[PDB]
Amino acid sequence: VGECVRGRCPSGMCCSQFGFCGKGPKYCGR
């Protein structure tokens, strides 16, 4: 859960190096 479409997620998240998403360090650089 929280997995990107291999680079993106819904309107506001950023995506990680496993392709999970959020607005924390490894998701958005912060």
Ligand SMILES: CC(=O)N[C@@H]1[C@@H](O)[C@H](O[C@@H]2O[C@H](CO)[C@@H](O[C@@H]3O[C@H](CO)[C@@H](O)[C@H](O)[C@H]3NC(C)=O)[C@H](O)[C@H]2NC(C)=O)[C@@H](CO)O[C@H]1O
């Ligand atoms: C400096 C660096 O990049 N170090 C590498 C480690 O980060 C990496 O571990 C894996 O990191 C990723 C994030 O980049 C982890 O992602 C998490 O994956 C879980 C899976 O259920 C997910 O729920 C989380 O949301 C997601 N978080 C983020 C922030 O994306 C992942 O868990 C780490 N390892 C494993 C085995 O799952 C390791 C190994 O890949 O390498 C370092 O070089």
